[PDB]
């Protein structure tokens, strides 16, 4: 598609592409959580964070907590 669908939830998490905080992860984690293994919508609503570029959200979460 490409008519009525613009990115929104991101303008606040624009500083997440290089630092997804506990509160930020709340948005990307929620969509990815809502969308069981999708990495399409999650990386589509927060434009700044693409699917292939979203990987920088998962390996960062466990880069200090080790919740693997």
Curated annotation (Swiss-Prot):
It is found in: Nucleus. Disulfide bonds: none annotated. Transmembrane segments: none annotated. It comes from the Eukaryota. Residues 1-68 are annotated as: Deacetylase activation domain (DAD). Residues 15-66 form the SANT domain. Induction: Regulated during cell cycle progression. Ubiquitous. High levels of expression are detected in lung, spleen and brain. 1D-myo-inositol 1,4,5,6-tetrakisphosphate binds at residues 37, 58-59. Forms a large corepressor complex that contains SIN3A/B and histone deacetylases HDAC1 and HDAC2. This complex associates with the thyroid (TR) and the retinoid acid receptors (RAR) in the absence of ligand, and may stabilize their interaction with TFIIB. Interacts directly with RARA in the absence of ligand; the interaction represses RARA activity. Interacts (isoform SMRT) with HDAC10. Interacts with MINT. Component of the N-Cor repressor complex, at least composed of NCOR1, NCOR2, HDAC3, TBL1X, TBL1R, CORO2A and GPS2. Interacts with CBFA2T3 and ATXN1L. Belongs to the N-CoR nuclear receptor corepressors family. The N-terminal region contains repression functions that are divided into three independent repression domains (RD1, RD2 and RD3). The C-terminal region contains the nuclear receptor-interacting domains that are divided in two separate interaction domains (ID1 and ID2). Transcriptional corepressor that mediates the transcriptional repression activity of some nuclear receptors by promoting chromatin condensation, thus preventing access of the basal transcription. Acts by recruiting chromatin modifiers, such as histone deacetylases HDAC1, HDAC2 and HDAC3. Required to activate the histone deacetylase activity of HDAC3. Involved in the regulation BCL6-dependent of the germinal center (GC) reactions, mainly through the control of the GC B-cells proliferation and survival. This is Nuclear receptor corepressor 2. It comes from Homo sapiens (Human). The gene is NCOR2. The chain holds residues 413 to 480 of 2514 of the full protein.
